[PDB]
């Protein structure tokens, strides 16, 4: 009743997962359902530990709004995608009432707000483009992105599919999206290696994550275009069930956190970069 089921997903530096049998220091306990094999539905919850920027936000919210929680990591998808009118990922966990809320690098967009409630944004994000330093790309609407076959050889660029970034590209730039799919990257780290090794000219992804990776790139060779420009500005938000009685208190707490300068310490704790 006052003990809430909360789902999360690992994406450094906002949610970081570690092994353990008692979580220590700034980490909180988070469980992950791990299957026995692929011929059964059997599995077991592995006790792990979670930390990061969004975990510190959850620790603050738990202290301020006064609630306890059982945190667990999503295993059915990632952030959230509507497949055959059925939501998976963290959104799906909230939509189908397996979790009271979702905390992490979860992007607020319109189609998700139709099925879940979002708190006020607390981490500014959107769509950015990471390239090797010096690449001439004006933005998302650059002709190398819009009309990629007007160039020989064509520009090579991709994203990590099934997230809010691909969803936006699929609706806004049809030709760009269908050309992009052959450059889909399994994850951020694969995309970074694809960039540095010359297999990829540009990587389009969540703004806050690319901002963090740019500041920590070895030699500071990978940069975001426009000096950290963001298309379709939005933010990470706490997802809640529609009509959740927790939303108002979560919003007031988040606005009170930023209003009293408490965000700066979490920023210097998790988000700083040398570059």
């Amino acid at each position: 009743d006052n003990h809430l089921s909360i789902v999360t997903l690992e994406e450094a530096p906002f949610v970081i997962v570690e092994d353990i049998e008692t979580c220590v220091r700034n980490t909180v306990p988070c469980r992950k359902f791990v299957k026995i094999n692929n011929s059964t539905n059997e599995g077991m919850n592995v006790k792990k530990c979670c930390k990061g920027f969004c975990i510190d936000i959850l620790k603050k919210l738990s202290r301020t709004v006064k609630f306890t929680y059982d945190l667990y990591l999503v295993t059915n998808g990632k952030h959230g995608k509507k497949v055959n009118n059925v939501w998976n990922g963290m959104i799906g966990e909230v939509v189908y009432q397996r979790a009271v809320m979702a905390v992490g690098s979860l992007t607020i967009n319109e189609e998700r707000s139709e099925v879940v409630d979002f708190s006020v944004p607390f981490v500014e994000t959107g769509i950015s483009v990471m390239v090797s330093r010096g690449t001439q790309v004006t933005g998302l609407s650059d002709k190398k992105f819009q009309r990629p076959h007007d160039y020989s050889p064509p520009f090579r660029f991709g994203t990590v599919p099934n997230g809010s970034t691909e969803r936006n590209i699929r609706n806004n730039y049809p030709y760009m999206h269908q050309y992009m799919t052959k450059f889909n990257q399994k994850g951020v780290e694969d995309a970074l290696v694809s960039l540095k090794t010359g297999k990829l000219d540009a990587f389009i992804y969540d703004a806050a994550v690319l901002n963090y990776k740019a500041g920590r790139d070895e030699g500071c060779k990978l940069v975001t275009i426009g000096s950290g420009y963001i298309f379709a500005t939005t933010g990470y938000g706490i997802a809640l069930q529609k009509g959740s009685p927790w939303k108002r208190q979560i919003d007031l707490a988040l606005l009170q956190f930023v209003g009293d300068g408490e965000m700066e310490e979490l920023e210097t704790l998790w988000l700083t970069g040398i570059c």
């Binding site: 319109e110 707000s113 979002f118 006020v120 944004p121 298309f231 939005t234 009170q256 930023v258």
Partner: protein, 273 residues
């Protein structure tokens, strides 16, 4: 028909007198398109209301929300020219007071989302992401929010903000800024335009205000510069009463406009050129 309240705040809300025939002059944007204008009433002390002409970023956003959600509207300027602050009993002034008293059904203005206001009204998702910065006369050398002339102030360097604004509460509520707040309380200005003019005429040496406003002023008036980046992030939101039936579709339309480039076009039309 919704009663819209707003406030003079370029480049978000321009305010010009009507023509002799009670109409607004036909003007054109930076891209050759016609500038959409609406008639807005407001005072020019007693407050004699006169029809005037409104246009800008927020007016374009208001027109989009009206066509998208199918509602009619009448626009008027806030009577006391203030954004909104809660000052035995407490009382809201400015656009906040007009929204809660029923004088307005919706606030369409560069209205900062803070904990104080969200306790009484409903904010949409932010339609503009910006922050706080400092405007100074070109040649004035201060590092930023942590400059000694600001943290250990005297009468040799005057800085202030707008009275009864979100920035005014910002320095009042944070005890870490108490030194700065007691310096500004004696010099806060009634409007941003007056404070900006005071920096031009070297009557005010630093203006702490919204970055989307101050950076636009520095782009059009080259004797003014902004020092440092943003020492604080803030955002503007549509303001409605908590029982409004339009609040969910308003917020969804804000997200849609962000995600299809409409908010970016407005930023190109009104902010960055």
């Amino acid at each position: 028909r919704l009663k819209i309240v707003t406030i003079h705040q370029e480049p978000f809300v321009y305010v010009k007198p009507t023509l002799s025939d009670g109409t607004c002059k036909e003007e054109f944007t930076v891209n050759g398109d016609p500038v959409k204008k609406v008639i807005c009433t407001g005072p020019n002390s007693p407050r004699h209301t006169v029809p005037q002409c409104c246009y800008g970023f927020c007016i374009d956003l208001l027109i989009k929300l009206a066509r998208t959600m199918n509602f009619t509207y009448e626009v008027h300027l806030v009577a006391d020219g203030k954004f909104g602050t809660q000052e035995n009993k407490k009382e809201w002034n400015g656009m906040m007071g007009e929204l809660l008293s029923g004088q307005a059904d919706m606030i369409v203005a560069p209205l900062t989302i803070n904990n104080e206001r969200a306790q009484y009204i409903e904010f949409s998702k932010p339609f503009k992401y910006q922050g706080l910065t400092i405007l100074v006369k070109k040649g004035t050398r201060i590092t930023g929010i942590n400059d000694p002339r600001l943290r250990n102030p005297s009468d040799k360097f005057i800085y202030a903000t707008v009275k009864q604004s979100s920035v005014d509460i910002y320095f009042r509520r944070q005890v870490e800024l108490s030194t700065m707040y007691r310096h500004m309380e004696k010099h806060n200005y009634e409007s941003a335009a007056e404070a900006i003019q005071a920096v031009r005429d070297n009557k005010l040496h630093a203006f702490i205000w919204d970055s989307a406003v101050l950076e636009f002023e520095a782009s059009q008036k080259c004797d003014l510069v902004t020092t440092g980046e943003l020492f604080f992030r803030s955002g503007f939101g549509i303001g409605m009463r908590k029982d409004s039936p339009w609040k969910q579709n308003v917020s969804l339309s804000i997200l849609k406009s962000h995600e299809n480039g409409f908010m970016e076009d407005l930023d190109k039309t009104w902010v960055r050129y």
